[PDB]
Amino acid sequence: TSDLIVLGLPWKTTEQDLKEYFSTFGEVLMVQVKKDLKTGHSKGFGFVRFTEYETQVKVMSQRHMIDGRWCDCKLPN
DNA sequence: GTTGAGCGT
């Protein structure tokens, strides 16, 4: 398993929210929501790591409606 | 108090 980058997150979406959402597919190791260090405002993308590689491809294969926006899980660059 | 292609100290 590898980290997946999550593009398109609503600005209000928190690491708590991601954990909840992604947990529905499989077991989650960690989630991150990248934020500006001065203001804490989310930058609109984050990361996720699953324990099971099965869950990763399942998640990588489809778009995701998270808090009102379609999001994409890709392999980072 | 804003936005929507954005890739991580």
Numbering used by the authors: 103 to 179
From the reporting publication:
However, further studies have revealed that TDP-43 is primarily an RNA-binding protein with multiple roles in the regulation of mRNA splicing, translation and transportation, and it is also present in Drosha complex for micro RNA processing and in stress granules for protecting mRNAs in stress conditions. TDP-43 is actually well equipped for RNA binding, as it contains two tandem RNA recognition motifs RRM1 and RRM2, besides the N-terminal domain (NTD) and the C-terminal glycine-rich region. Yet TDP-43 is abnormally aggregated forming inclusions in neuronal cells in amyotrophic lateral sclerosis (ALS) and frontotemporal lobar degeneration (FTLD).
The final refined model contained one hRRM1 polypeptide chain (residues 103–179) and one ssDNA (G1 to T9) with an R-factor/R-free of 20.65/25.86% for 4301/430 reflections up to a resolution of 2.75 Å. The ssDNA was bound on the flat surface of the β-sheet of hRRM1 interacting mainly with RNP2 and RNP1 segments. In summary, hRRM1 bound the ssDNA via nonbonded, π-π stacking interactions and hydrogen bonding, and it might specify the preference for a GC-rich sequence: X-G4-X-G6-C7-G8.
